[PDB]
Design a protein around this ligand. Structure first.
Ligand SMILES: Nc1ncnc2c1ncn2[C@@H]1O[C@H](COP(=O)(O)OP(=O)(O)O)[C@@H](O)[C@H]1O
Ligand SMILES: [Ca+2]
Lengths: 68, 375, 464, 68
């Protein structure tokens, strides 16, 4: 029975190493993307303010043009 | 390869050495800069100890090594060890003789005049080097893109350099030298970990800190908002089961140390954040030079790979500075080898003859020949 | 050579026919059109003639160099790119085209759009196609071998579609390269049967770690469009260069003999000195060869031969010997020389074309035999151009594209990809490692090409 | 030795399931974030186009004002 258990243990550790490796690459991929997601989120917010500012200044210029 | 002397390419720092074969694009052998003793007694007969252990040999087995740091910003506690460190590079891996090919090195800005001559003495007198040169870190990372107007900030383990080299070099002061890079970060963490009980004492595990750092640790976007986030245990508590056998949940420890970068007040100095030093190098130059500097800011050095290092710059620079031009920072993706890319160039340039030093040139103008003529 | 060398053997004069028909054979595949000649060969060739025990020849090898590889992306109006791309279309059955994922419309692609021209007034490939096919099967290139070769272009045509819409993704740093239409980049890897994602992540992006082992490739380096397009082409060319030279060797598989080994009579044949009313970089390389060709004669009919006169001890005296022009050689070899100052600038990417120009006028225009506008006050020369005096007349050059076209630098990132692929050809195009060129592999091609020309001169000096 | 082999088989088989479980969850988390990242990237690029227009319109109004 020991010989049979040893055989099952050998292949078990091999599958374990493969599983952990797949998880290690998956958790890393999820991370780098999460960082990029937050990096893009900040860029989206800072530009969201610029877009509004760019619109308001345009409307203000039009109102300024109407006066003159 | 065969015809023509063919020169090598190298870039030595105060932490990691970069060197490969000849005519290459990137370093082929990057061994760590470590050399300690066997405070213990080697087995003493299970080899006549000596070899403080170095290269992948020492790094593989730190355990019984009292890692002695020879090169500390400027001062080299001992030169005798450096001789046998270079006797390993060119031969054990590259399998080529320096008594045949030229050599290229890097220059740490504002380094004692006596050092640049002591090194050359080792080459010309013993390693017989009829042709070599020592170029300036940052300037190399430059000549490798497509413009003659950019400001560069090159650093790694040695010291920080804010060099606005674009159209020319050296005028009033602009450039800055700050002893706060790499080794400084590795030294600061162990001190702060003591608050939680963890105390990586000896210099061997001190290196483990650096190893662990470059895998998960990141920079705080805003320490204020991230502090309140500590209440949650998802973005904070990070898993890293010690290869030995004891997990270290680096949660608030990851984005704590990097804060020192922007706040040098935590390391006993008056130096301001790296976004103030940026102004310090811009306000000095002419007035009609700024609008294009903001449009191009080169950030070299593998140190600038920490998550949350570039996005912070746009927040602090746009604050206390002119805001009607294109604020733009060029942070090369793999910016660690930016110096190596430029190094392979100088070694292949022909105009290089106008700059390099020849065997006889070292004897005619004496040892000072180098930095007495060039800059 | 024959008759003199010879005769009897029925398997001699008969196979001599297929060998004499080998000339027009290779003039239909690798050749293209030039304004100076229609049957313009587009591959270096230094043939070699061996002999048999009976008298007839046994076979010979072939060697090329550089290969013109800027015509695929850029050329003058009216001119036309390689023949294989156009003759193949107006011929193959529509059914054969669809199988390769092709549509009867050049503008739709990129490989044929980079020029802007498609139809030629003088050429009728629809009819000329039957002349090439008659050469395909007659020699010994069955459709099986043809399709095999087409599987390489089939991929290239799937890779060629990969165009870009200037991606200003990076908030600041450097504009990256985005590919929304991924099916082009997907089909690109479908033929190679490699991970579509990893491929783009391991090529367009450079990576290195290192530590006695051999690194873990993944780290990213997005770069500008020019460098991206540079890398794209750099591979597209060398991939086909090695094949053609290995193809002609396999054409000799049913021709070359391996029974005797003996003396070798060589025959030289290289691109000719073309002349337009408007030159550029690609002309320099061709015109440069002539500068070496003139040096060859002066080395032979004026030096090595004169030394033979006195060796015999026969009346001879040095009659007006015009300049041996070794200056034209030293001006572009040893330090402080053209290509030594040129290739050096090719690496200094921050030295574009205008700055590079200034590194020539100052370095020269003082050394003899080289003019420009500044020194020689002639309006015909532009402020950005210069006057290069050959051993013949005068030629002026432009600057458009100088760098990316000249650099040639091909690192081991675009090359290694195909090597690690799974296909009997993709790795086959890269034949048994180290064919007459080994030494050390990893190094810019700027020096590799320099060795190619040096392998041409050194082997011509010590001979008859 | 059999008891030890069986013991290692238990902890290995269990850790194997956990490793595989984590690999799926990590990939699951990667997917949901990747999708959002792409949506943001697209939305951001669209705003940039509007940002440029908003500025050009604002400038055009200013130039039109100077004339009057
Ligand atoms: N992938 C990485 N991410 C972040 N930091 C990294 C990474 N790889 C290396 N580093 C760090 O870069 C530094 C070494 O960079 P290097 O350019 O060799 O420095 P120096 O030349 O000053 O010795 C070390 O602090 C190391 O931890
Ligand atoms: Ca440094």
């Amino acid at each position: 029975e020991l010989d049979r258990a040893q055989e099952r243990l050998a292949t078990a550790l091999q599958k374990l190493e493969e599983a952990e490796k797949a998880a290690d690459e998956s958790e890393r991929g999820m991370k780098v993307i999460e960082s990029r997601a937050q990096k893009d989120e900040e860029k989206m917010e800072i530009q969201e303010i610029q877009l509004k500012e760019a619109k308001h200044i345009a409307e203000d210029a039009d109102r300024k043009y109407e006066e003159v | 390869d065969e015809d023509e002397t063919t020169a090598l390419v190298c870039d030595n720092g105060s932490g990691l050495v970069k060197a490969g074969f000849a005519g290459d694009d990137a370093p082929r052998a990057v061994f760590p800069s470590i050399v300690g003793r066997p405070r213990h007694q080697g087995v003493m007969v299970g080899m006549g100890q000596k070899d403080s252990y170095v290269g992948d040999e020492a790094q593989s087995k730190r355990g019984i090594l009292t890692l002695k740091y020879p090169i500390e910003h400027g001062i080299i506690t001992n030169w005798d060890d450096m001789e046998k460190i270079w006797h390993h590079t060119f031969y054990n891996e590259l399998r080529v003789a320096p008594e045949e090919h030229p050599t290229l090195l890097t220059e740490a800005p504002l380094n004692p005049k006596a050092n640049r001559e002591k090194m050359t003495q080792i080459m010309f007198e013993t390693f017989n080097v009829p042709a070599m040169y020592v170029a300036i870190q940052a300037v190399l990372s430059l000549y490798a893109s497509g413009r003659t107007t950019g400001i560069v900030l090159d650093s790694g383990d040695g010291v920080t350099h804010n060099v606005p080299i674009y159209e020319g070099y050296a005028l009033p002061h602009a450039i800055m030298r700050l002893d706060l890079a790499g080794r400084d970060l590795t030294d600061y963490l162990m001190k702060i970990l003591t608050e939680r009980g963890y105390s990586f004492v000896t210099t061997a595990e001190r290196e483990i800190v650096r190893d662990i750092k470059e895998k998960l640790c990141y920079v705080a976007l805003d320490f204020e908002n991230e502090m309140a986030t500590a209440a949650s245990s998802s973005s904070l508590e990070k898993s890293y089961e010690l290869p030995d056998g004891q997990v270290i949940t680096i949660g608030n420890e990851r984005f704590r140390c990097p804060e020192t970068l922007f706040q040098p007040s935590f390391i006993g100095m008056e130096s301001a954040g790296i976004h103030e030093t940026t102004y310090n190098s811009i306000m000095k130059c002419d007035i009609d030079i700024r609008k294009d500097l903001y449009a191009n800011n080169v950030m070299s050095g593998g140190t600038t790979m920490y998550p949350g290092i570039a996005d912070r710059m746009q927040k602090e620079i746009t604050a206390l500075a002119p805001s009607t031009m294109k604020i733009k920072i060029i942070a090369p993706p793999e910016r660690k080898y930016s110096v190596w890319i430029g190094g392979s160039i100088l070694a292949s340039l022909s105009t290089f003859q106008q700059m390099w030093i020849t065997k006889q040139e070292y004897d005619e103008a004496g040892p000072s020949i180098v930095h007495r003529k060039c800059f | 050579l024959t008759f003199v060398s010879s005769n009897q053997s029925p398997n001699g004069e008969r196979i001599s026919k297929m060998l004499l028909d080998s000339n027009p054979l290779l003039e239909a595949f690798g050749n293209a059109k030039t304004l100076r000649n229609d049957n313009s060969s587009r591959f270096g060739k230094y043939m070699e003639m061996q002999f048999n025990a009976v008298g007839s020849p046994i076979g010979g090898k072939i060697t090329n160099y550089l290969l013109e590889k800027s015509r695929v992306v850029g050329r003058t109006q009216g001119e036309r790119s390689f023949h294989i791309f156009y003759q193949m279309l107006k011929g193959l059955s529509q059914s054969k085209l669809d199988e390769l994922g092709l549509t009867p419309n050049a503008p739709a692609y990129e490989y044929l759009k980079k020029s802007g021209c498609f139809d030629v007034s003088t050429i009728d490939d629809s009819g000329e196609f039957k002349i090439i096919v008659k050469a395909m099967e007659t020699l010994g290139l069955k459709e099986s071998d043809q399709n095999s070769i087409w599987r390489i272009l089939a991929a290239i045509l799937h890779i060629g579609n990969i165009t870009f819409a200037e991606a200003a993704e990076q908030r600041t740093g450097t504009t990256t390269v985005k590919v929304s239409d991924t099916k082009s980049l997907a089909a690109a890897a479908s033929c190679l049967k490699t991970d579509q994602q990893s491929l783009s992540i391991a090529l367009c992006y450079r990576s290195i770690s290192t530590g006695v082992g051999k690194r873990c490739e993944v780290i990213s380096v997005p770069m500008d469009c020019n460098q991206a397009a540079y890398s794209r082409d750099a591979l597209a060319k060398a991939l086909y260069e090695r094949l053609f030279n290995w193809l002609v060797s396999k054409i000799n598989t049913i021709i070359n003999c391996t029974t005797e080994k003996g003396p070798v009579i060589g025959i030289l044949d290289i691109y000719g000195f073309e002349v337009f009313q408007n030159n550029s970089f690609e002309q320099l390389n061709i015109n440069f060869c002539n500068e070496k060709l003139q040096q060859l004669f002066i080395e032979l009919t004026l030096k090595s031969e004169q030394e033979e006169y006195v060796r015999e001890g026969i009346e001879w005296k040095n009659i007006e010997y015009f300049n041996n022009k070794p200056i034209c050689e030293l001006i572009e070899k040893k330090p402080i020389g053209l290509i030594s100052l040129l290739d050096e600038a090719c690496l200094i990417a921050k030295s574009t074309d205008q700055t590079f120009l200034d590194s020539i006028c100052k370095q020269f225009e003082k050394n003899p035999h080289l003019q420009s506008y500044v020194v020689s006050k002639d309006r015909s020369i532009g402020d950005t151009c210069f006057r290069l005096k050959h051993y013949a007349g005068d030629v002026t050059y432009d600057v458009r594209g100088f760098l990316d076209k000249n650099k040639d630098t091909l690192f081991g990132d675009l090359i290694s990809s195909m090597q690690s692929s799974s296909d009997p050809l993709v790795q086959g195009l890269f034949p048994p490692t180290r064919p007459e060129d080994s030494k050390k592999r990893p190094e810019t091609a700027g020096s590799q090409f320099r060795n190619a020309m040096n392998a041409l001169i050194t082997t011509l000096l010590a001979c008859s």
